């Protein structure tokens, strides 16, 4: 059938040069998450698709610049899988990759540029990459087949490379690499062998940023280091006739009095029929300040115009700053992983440009649960925080269409990692973190105002970082160790908790009272910790599955005729059981274990009906609440590799087996939540909302 | 100029022997099961390093940055630093958190974004932040072959262990979960692998008298088996939430008088050998947290005054630090292997300006970089070129007396360059030379 | 380290008084031995023999207690029938001051002789003060009263049920070892001065009846024969097993009978019955078997209660022996003008050498260990040629010669006290006359077999000198120095003058053009040619006409002998436990020693 993804939520990696913004009209944004590269359109507020091609973390992105001031839609990404990859889009969907060979080391930064060789008809690009083993390697393109031009063992020992930059001077390629202590290496090739043209040295400390520029006939080399100095060389040369380079030093500034992770010029944009490239230098320091340098101020001082940033909140600064299509808006990459966009809007003092930057978890997402009616969504992750997303229906005053989704609140900033979560009320929810207790958080009255403002402007970064917390009310002592799994009742009357256990004394399931918060029961049959367990749609049963490869339908009187039932089994499965699910009519229940054998049991004796083998191990199983007239069932299982499989089960083959997506999830799935449409979460910062239509 | 110390802390956890017995060591306060919420083991939460850590939410990067920035702003701007890891059994945790913690702690130096510990240290060695060593605390049943290898991989130079007593009945009583022979084996393995061991000892344990204390300390400083390289004096304190408080409430336990404590400290610090340093003399807990014990933290001056009134003068390394100096050499057997200790002493005013420790590979040292028939320089230190002179003497002693073919020295990642001007290579974490 | 050696030996044969001897005692201020004998007999026969024999109040055939007072001017005796009788020898007076109709098994006294206690034969213990009146009495009981936070058949075939009692050096605690019959085992318990139980003994699997307490008050000895080996264990003051050391003998072929400590808590004496008596010591928690003495039946042993290193042995054949001891290293220094130095150390069945010219080695380590089947007794080095060493064992008087690998030669086929070595093959082995106590110099030289020669001389010889370069012997007497004794000719005893006090250490040195005499006594007084120079010298060294002395007051002093004159920076301050060992002439390598067990080298 069909399977469309409504929305995704992601966050850039914490590498220095993680995101890059395209030049010219219709600029585009591309950054990186756990094992993938995510696209993003600044004009809109939506993510198109991700470039799922890697196996490790991705550390560098770069747009292949096009000379004539037009969108390119081809890029290069270097990861931590020892892999540099060239990608071509030319559209919003074309996913074609080349997947170059090994580099022997996780790359940190790469670059690429078009050769501009017309004589050889259409010319192609080249790639220069640096890695952990302190080498520089050249990869070129000349059509469909990649070219391994040459290798250059930059050094032998621990003499590393700090940055990299590529631009042909006038007729021949020119490479600018960085040597850690003070040096910038300027290379040049004769026919294909790059021979050292010169080495510049003017920095007292480690050099971090290097950038090319062109103005008239003179090239410009900008650099930034950790020695409280920003260093620029205007440079007029001739390409090596065997001639050499003729560099010139200039005045420097006194910016930021700290480290400068990045620096950039201003690109060339098409306006009033001609191309414009202003003289601008923009830095990215660590003191949470940014300085808008100006050219010479008609005298040579190069003094600023305004320095954005307040030293109050975060002292750790940024890792990147880039431009929009022109000198209109400026984006920056925060240390913790958040983004920050600024816009001028026809006024010399710039202001913030919120409501546009996308945000997400910067550590693995563990759990989520749907809204009781379908209004918002709440996610918990190992980043010690909890996040709340809700859609924006207060879209532009004339454009009320295309409702988007944005994160709304950061309820708790915790001191552990959160493992289990359940929702007890529209404005209340219980979370079990790494502690031995459980906590309960309820919405305040200072939130509903803005919530109805926006869901009937979205908060900025600072408002989320300072003034969005939810006060704590409760505290649930009674466990001994970490909390592994929790459930909830249909009518919000009963809880169900399980603690991380290794013996039979701590393997006791505990039930609580929603109204009074008092322990009223303690059941104990399982020999080990209970990985998962769930109530039936009706209150007649309660199923549990543990790591002892056995299930238990162990329910007794609540004590708040029999109002429960009990039955167990010796052993059926061979590996650890992970997921258990019920049926809308309470007639069957499904169990899925790591040995990828999903088994149904019918509603004394509790036999099986049929067994099914899946290509990979299962980690989550869910059943669509809506029934079908032909007396069938729908299961949506999520596996370890990052795939979802939808099957139809029919009473006694005759089971539907072919319904799965592509480019779905990079890493493992944790749970699947239907809406009473389903949401998927994983250990790779990816939470997504899907849609099925049948 | 001088080197500024940087202190960190780990995340709360449980000590590893709780799973077998059912309770932690009696006298240890704090932890996940104490009124001091979100506080690591063996700590209350009201100490400088402690509240800096707890306001950092226990991440190496942020707290290292705060410490470095504060020290720089104070007006020092030092070149070298020395990390210290504090609180609880650091290697009772899963290895993933260990790797994450150490790699981020190393990356916090210059700014690298290493994905793994290997590249983290390989990049840190090229930095301008010249870190000279990291110290790790470990209990004897978790200082074994694998744990020692993990020590060496992270690039730590010194390690600290807590024995607290030399009587088996005290271990059986206070529920340490390990026999006293474990201390012997741990000292043997640590000392015959290049590490510099600094030990913890407490006066006034339960069921321990007064003369028994002097007897046990004499045994400690005379027996070859129990000779440490650094002393960690920690008077016993009673703090709520522990079995010691339960005993003290029933009137069973009792504490020494102030004068008795002063005299005992004077006697103990009077018999310390000149080659042994005294790192800590008193516990760092503030005033109101402890119920009974020493209520004033200036024990150093009181002990020094008592010693001056007595008639004995200290020879500790702390007080013997900064008309011509002369080379003095000392020898002894410790932990089953002949050692040597060289120094430049000024017997005129009884001070020193340079020192060095050397030890011959005893036997069956598992560290393959050694492989037997080698010597190890456990520490070198200079005050204020005496270092090359000390290295010359050490090379002469290694070649002549020990009868060795290869020699090795342990160094922090920030100083392995300084041993390259002499002609050393790198094997594992050691600087290596051939004889 | 240091090595004990023989010294002034005394032997007396008084007369066979009635029947046999049971227990004796030593009177210090009047310097005599008084012996008790069956048939009521207190004889102060030894020395000038102011013998006052009395008939003690038939009766029991054994007397258990004999003790001097030295302050109340009497001797207290007790017999197996329980008759504590105060007797004064000068007046021939008897009085049964104390008497219990139960019997007495043992008698002991306080170190200051202020209190005493008796063990009645009815398994009770009573306590009296100087006035022999009972103040308290208990028995053997359980329920140690919870001291500290603490609260089959396993008896020896030859175990004796007689309890043992020991005291402490400072006289604050006393330990009692008895037998428990309900379990048929051995038990120990400690009591305070105010006579209240303070501790007990942990459960042990097989313990002997021996007991002894260190006068320093730190440890208590015991037997504890293991199922596999045989040991000697220790009990701390609170009654727990803390350390041990192993006897080198075999299972089921020897037994322990007694344990003793000297006056300064530095020598341990052990009695073994099949018989041997061995003296040990402690290095760095390593027990050196210093010396051994095999005897065929010994009645009793006694350390000297006033001066250290002096033992008295009483045998069944009415034989009484007294032995002294000396405390000095066995150095090979001064061997030649060549840069030579090394030290030898005796331990168990082997000898440990330390070469101090090419190496520096702490006590427990060694270079060139040498093994000998029987325990060794003495070592010595040569005069001018080489550094070959001669060793005498304490079993068969065999001399073993080691060439300086380690070429060995020895005779293939008590007495022999001082075995001085002369380089070619010559042994000078002095001795003493039986029942006459006169020094008898000998001249013994090596199917070759040792052959000796006999010469006589009046006087008692304290210590031989060292035969220097092309020099003959030189002997010490109780006053002055005599007997130049040309090596190849028995010569006269003319002066080389008159020692004020017989020096503990002594030497003769060619100071400039004159051969002077140097000595050092226990008074820390450093005597040159019968002149008192300084009174604070602990150890001395001489070589290349330089003197090195220890001020005993935190300073080591050097003074040249080139001017051949001296009279009471340059100096170098030193710590407390300093004691000088071998020196290097050219390198000026002064090796200083500390009590903890380490070394130090100072140029
Ligand atoms: C910070 S702890 C060292 C780390 C930890 N004890 C370990 O196992 O390595 C320093 C010393 O404090 C001692 N200590 C613990 N509780 C104490 C108390 N209540 N009073 C005094 N010293 C205490 C520990 O035994 C340890 O030797
Ligand atoms: S192992 Fe160390 S830190 Fe842990 S409870 Fe015991 S003394 Fe405290």
Author numbering:
A (entry chain B): 4 to 245, 268 to 481, 544 to 647, 656 to 698, 709 to 757, 764 to 787, 811 to 828
B (entry chain C): 85 to 406, 418 to 479, 496 to 546
C (entry chain A): 1 to 57, 66 to 159, 185 to 307, 318 to 339, 345 to 452, 479 to 487, 502 to 534, 544 to 593, ...
Q: What did the original publication write about this model?
A:
In eukaryotes, wobble uridines are modified by Elongator, a large and highly conserved macromolecular complex.
To determine the structure of MmElp123, we vitrified freshly purified samples in absence and presence of in vitro transcribed mouse tRNA ArgUCU. We optimized the sample preparation procedure, collected large datasets and solved structures that are with and without tRNA at 4.35 Å and 4.0 Å resolutions, respectively. In detail, the spatial arrangement of Elp2, Elp3 and the N-terminal region of Elp1 are very similar to the tRNA-bound MmElp123 and the ScElp123 structures. Strikingly, the CTD of MmElp1, which is visible in the yeast Elp123, remains flexible in MmElp123 in the absence of tRNA. This observation indicates that yeast Elp123 is inherently more stable in the absence of tRNAs and that the binding of tRNAs induces structural rearrangements in the Elp1 CTD of mammals. The coordination of this ligand is similar to the 5′-dA molecule found in ScElp123. Nonetheless, the structural similarities between the subcomplexes (pre and post SAM cleavage), suggest that the cleavage reaction itself does not induce major rearrangements in the active site of Elp3 or in the coordination of the adenosine moiety. First, the MmElp123 harbors a SAM molecule that is bound to the iron-sulfur cluster, indicating that SAM binding occurs before tRNA binding.
